[PDB]
Amino acid sequence: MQATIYDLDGNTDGEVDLPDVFETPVRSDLIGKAVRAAQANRKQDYGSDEYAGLRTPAESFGSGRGQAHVPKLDGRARRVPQAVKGRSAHPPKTEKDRSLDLNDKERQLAVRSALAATADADLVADRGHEFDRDEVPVVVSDDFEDLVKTQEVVSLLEALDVHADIDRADETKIKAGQGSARGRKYRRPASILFVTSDEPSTAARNLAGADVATASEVNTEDLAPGGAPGRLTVFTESALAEVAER
Amino acid sequence: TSKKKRQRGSRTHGGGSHKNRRGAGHRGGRGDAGRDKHEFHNHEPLGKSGFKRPQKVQEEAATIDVREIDENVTLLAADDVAEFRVDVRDVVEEADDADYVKVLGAGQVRHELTLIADDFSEGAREKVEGAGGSVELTDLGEERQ
Amino acid sequence: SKTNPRLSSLIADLKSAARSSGGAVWGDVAERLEKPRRTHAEVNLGRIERYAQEDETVVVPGKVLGSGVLQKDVTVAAVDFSGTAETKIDQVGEAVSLEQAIENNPEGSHVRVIR
Amino acid sequence: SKQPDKQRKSQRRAPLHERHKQVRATLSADLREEYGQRNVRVNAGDTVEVLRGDFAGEEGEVINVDLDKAVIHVEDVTLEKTDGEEVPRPLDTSNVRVTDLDLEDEKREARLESEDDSA
RNA sequence: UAUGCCAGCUGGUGGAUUGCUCGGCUCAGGCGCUGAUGAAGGACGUGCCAAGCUGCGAUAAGCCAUGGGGAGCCGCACGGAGGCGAAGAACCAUGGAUUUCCGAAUGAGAAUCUCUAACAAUUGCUUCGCGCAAUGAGGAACCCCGAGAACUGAAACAUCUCAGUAUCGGGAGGAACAGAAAACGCAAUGUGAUGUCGUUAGUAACCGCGAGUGAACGCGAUACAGCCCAAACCGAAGCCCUCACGGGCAAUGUGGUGUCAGGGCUACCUCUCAUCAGCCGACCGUCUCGACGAAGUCUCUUGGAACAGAGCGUGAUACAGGGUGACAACCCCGUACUCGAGACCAGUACGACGUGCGGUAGUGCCAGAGUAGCGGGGGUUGGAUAUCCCUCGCGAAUAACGCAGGCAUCGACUGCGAAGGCUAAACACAACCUGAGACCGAUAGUGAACAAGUAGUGUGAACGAACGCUGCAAAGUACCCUCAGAAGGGAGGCGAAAUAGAGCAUGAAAUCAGUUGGCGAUCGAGCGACAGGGCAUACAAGGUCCCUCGACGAAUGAC
RNA sequence: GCAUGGCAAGUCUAACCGGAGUAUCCGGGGAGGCACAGGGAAACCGACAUGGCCGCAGGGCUUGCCCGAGGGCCGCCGUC
Ligand SMILES: [Cl-]
Ligand SMILES: [Cl-]
Ligand SMILES: [Cl-]
Ligand SMILES: [Mg+2]
Ligand SMILES: [Mg+2]
Ligand SMILES: [Mg+2]
Ligand SMILES: [Mg+2]
Ligand SMILES: [Mg+2]
Ligand SMILES: [Mg+2]
Ligand SMILES: [Mg+2]
Ligand SMILES: [Mg+2]
Ligand SMILES: [Mg+2]
Ligand SMILES: [Mg+2]
Ligand SMILES: [Mg+2]
Ligand SMILES: [Mg+2]
Ligand SMILES: [Mg+2]
Ligand SMILES: [Mg+2]
Ligand SMILES: [Mg+2]
Ligand code: NA
Ligand code: NA
Ligand code: NA
Ligand code: NA
Ligand code: NA
Ligand code: NA
Ligand code: NA
Ligand code: NA
Ligand code: NA
Ligand code: NA
Ligand code: NA
Ligand code: NA
Ligand code: NA
Ligand code: NA
Ligand code: NA
Ligand code: NA
Ligand code: NA
Ligand code: NA
Ligand code: NA
Ligand code: NA
Ligand code: NA
């Protein structure tokens, strides 16, 4: 198919052939499995102290005093699971493998599939993104990589009728739950993904809900955040071309 | 919903009488315990059998059937064509950590083949010649007498 | 409980054709695909070549694999083909998706089931 | 340190000289233009205007600055005790704006003017 | 209708619940020895008032210098009084001063004190004098060398297993240990120090051949690095102390040469770029710390308070996180970007100085003994005949010799030189620094968020808790009455709120006081389920229900 | 064992290496494992890409008659 290239003014400037991979059949299940794995693998190992609740010589008196056979010390119950200050019976364990494996084939397939979901205006719209465009993904001249001010990228997006998505992500959610006590107080929608070729767009990265990536290593997560296909993306003339061989 | 997930409230978690799930006694012994007594059933019999030759006095033959060779003659475009001629040593994988390459005669031979290998079986030979072919024995193959 | 949205859709299409058109193979293939993946068909060229015949579409309620040799010029329809299989088959015949088969022949006529 | 616990801890246990930054306040438009800084460490000599509390709107001279509690006393910003006495209602520099500076210190004024350091 | 039963209401008790987090737990990166120059630990001191904690040491919450920092300060700790600071204090970094007594504890003794100069004790050197030096003890675990269980498993139990585990003795370092082949043995025309990781493999091997136990070569990686003596041939050409003088060591050999690319010696060729000794001496990176750092505190509404809603506007290489009277990129700290400093990498790499590598021919000059090896007995190992070690006895050759290649002997072949020595890097731990989190969230998580190894128990080894939350701001309740009264109570004052009034956020249940509805001093006990009646009921969140008649009308079905 | 999913006569990487947005992630790495041949203590030898018959589903035809994967019953082949 065709890809309409845009100049830093938002005006059409020729067009390139949309590589084949963007035609790869959308397989949300595989995508979901790749995002699941990526997220699991970055989880840290944890678990309680191996000796918690065992640091004591508490003993049970046995029969004879009308007391249940519970270990006690200084007349205070201890060690056993049912006692206060006793050991956790089946607690978290450092030894547990909390990582997930995934065949390179199955994973690359999902990357390709996520890529393809990007070129479907309906999907992108369903995924939730806000925009008033017909063609997708948004392709732009490599001159984009030279921008430096965020503000400039904004004008360009407003001209590309895609700024509305950043307006969407310009809202933080104060989460329900104690995550808050652990530094996870906030969370926000995901907006546009900027895929460049040489280096991630420094000028666009601070944009609300935006994520910047590079054609050589852009992955399933940035292509389909949360395992949801169809992320409003903007490729770079060159980026678009590199992506084709992934 | 999994089975485990439905266990809360069952009291016995499918163990039957609560007097069941205790120690190794419910298993009749630890590990292979009783493989000769109460649980002899479905355990290979006791005893020694035969012998083994030292590992380094052992020879591992890399093998391949004519059917394989034959089914991919055309596909082996990168291998001699004549009146085909193929050096098996260059076909068989594992032909390195192998003491020698041997061609076996399983399947059919629908082409005229000239095979070069360290060894051949009767069937391999009959079949390869039967299709107007020949079998060439390698220098290593010069170990027949 | 199938996970593949595609496999899922194929199966629904196979039914719609078996019901509407007079097809019976399509409904037959549908039921086998609904069954556990382990029971699905995994056929190599050697078997297709042995029992197929020209002008009779070969239907594999599974996947076709490239072991062996195929010379007959037949049309094979499967859920999927390994890359080698689809290459060997198009050299002497035609590899076709079950979704195309359902469209070029909703009546499921002159078809042979191989597994 | 992105972790809330550590953030709060380091703010509460910061040594004395590291608390000066906790008693900083925005500078009036004029002042910001004059010294090229957005804020300054409120001193017991500056004049300041209340932008947020129940006293928002009022102006007065900064009477005291407590580094430990990171709070300031502004003249006339007080509370009526039961006995009738009038005591100061501590204010967080964050709800205050400096409109006039006490520059009797060579050092302070120097810092203010230079463009490589802030006071 | 007393005693009383059930439910609720108001107040209480209690401290669950929800919310919060100054603490934990775990992972990850960095870093890493201290001590006779008296450590670590402890004791007792030290403040204007000072009991605990922290700091500090008779110069006692401190003294000095340099740098940073800045108008405030006088630790936790917010009182009273007083004081310090522009003579630049507080506070931070580095360096320095001081640094009681016990304590390895070292003049001697002792429950932290005492008696009349002291390296006590054991050592090396020695001016043979404690003159010059060493050792001792600590440390989270990691490391190395020794000593070495049992419960348990084998459904009993002995060999075996648990397990060379637990525990004990000795000792090093920041890492230890190992290490340049008398190796390997995909047997080769092959590999080429050593750890470690992945694999090889639960393979080979062991085993009442039961239960169990269990490698290696090789391969892929990490990191890479190779050397010095003994001797032959020389023979005082040498080394240590001392500024020097002078002394000591050393023919029982200091020093030269030399170390399987064998060497020496004799005759030659060529040459040095190997090696060894010493000089110089980083970049980058990484960890930590620091400087600078953009943009609203505008309108109306609600509110005690805007960080809320609606409206207008702004930054962004910065929309991580925190604070601020409620949901904050733009109010404050910070964050991106840039920059600086210290530490580690490392006395390493690079550079350079000196030395001289190597080759031919001749020469039976040299080349580590209770050893190699055999036998008895034990232990250990996967090691089987073929592991490693200890003990007792026996015991060899001399490179023209010797050892190894998984039984012994002889021959061949291949590899390789034991009985002398050193050796960076890659790996272990987590005290210390910092970071992180689908971990816990105050009966959890550490025993310990609090006085925590605290209070408290035991003669002692040792054992060992519980206790978090006023409010935006103390505005922490003046004045008056009462009272034995700084108690308590009444009235009153503050605040959005006192039912936020002090162990004070919320405030469950069990349960208590008072009270409302129902029952009740002639009556029977799983306390209810389903039916149906009495009595009782503010709104809200349910709105149905009753009777005449009439329509429909299954099974059944009359007078 | 089973369900789902990727690849298929193959399949998967391990330690580790490079990149980077720096525990995630992209690329590399097939050492090695299992599968592709078995039988035999060992020496050692070394198999049906189909020869026959029933017949389900399905297909075909002129509507019982053919073709009949899978399945079943035999033959035949490797090896001890
Ligand atoms: Cl064998
Ligand atoms: Cl097949
Ligand atoms: Cl080798
Ligand atoms: Mg606990
Ligand atoms: Mg909750
Ligand atoms: Mg290989
Ligand atoms: Mg300035
Ligand atoms: Mg003494
Ligand atoms: Mg037993
Ligand atoms: Mg037994
Ligand atoms: Mg080691
Ligand atoms: Mg063992
Ligand atoms: Mg070996
Ligand atoms: Mg020498
Ligand atoms: Mg043993
Ligand atoms: Mg606790
Ligand atoms: Mg309360
Ligand atoms: Mg009765
Ligand atoms: Na304890
Ligand atoms: Na009891
Ligand atoms: Na783990
Ligand atoms: Na069961
Ligand atoms: Na049970
Ligand atoms: Na058993
Ligand atoms: Na028996
Ligand atoms: Na360190
Ligand atoms: Na005190
Ligand atoms: Na000191
Ligand atoms: Na000494
Ligand atoms: Na002496
Ligand atoms: Na037993
Ligand atoms: Na017994
Ligand atoms: Na045994
Ligand atoms: Na090899
Ligand atoms: Na503020
Ligand atoms: Na012996
Ligand atoms: Na050897
Ligand atoms: Na508590
Ligand atoms: Na391989």
Side-chain angles (χ1 to χ4, degrees), chain C residues 68-87:
Chain C
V69 186
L70 177 71
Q71 300 185 304
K72 304 184 167 180
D73 162 57
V74 291
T75 295
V76 179
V79 181
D80 186 22
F81 315 69
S82 62
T84 287
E86 178 165 52
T87 292

Side-chain angles (χ1 to χ4, degrees), chain A residues 69-104:
Chain A
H69 305 182
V70 175
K72 276 176 177 174
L73 200 79
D74 286 340
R76 206 136 262 286
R78 259 159 189 55
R79 186 188 295 110
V80 304
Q82 73 266 39
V84 173
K85 302 307 284 300
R87 54 172 279 262
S88 191
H90 296 295
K93 296 185 201 165
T94 263
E95 310 80 290
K96 173 164 191 187
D97 189 350
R98 310 155 197 267
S99 77
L100 300 167
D101 268 52
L102 182 61
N103 302 359
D104 282 312

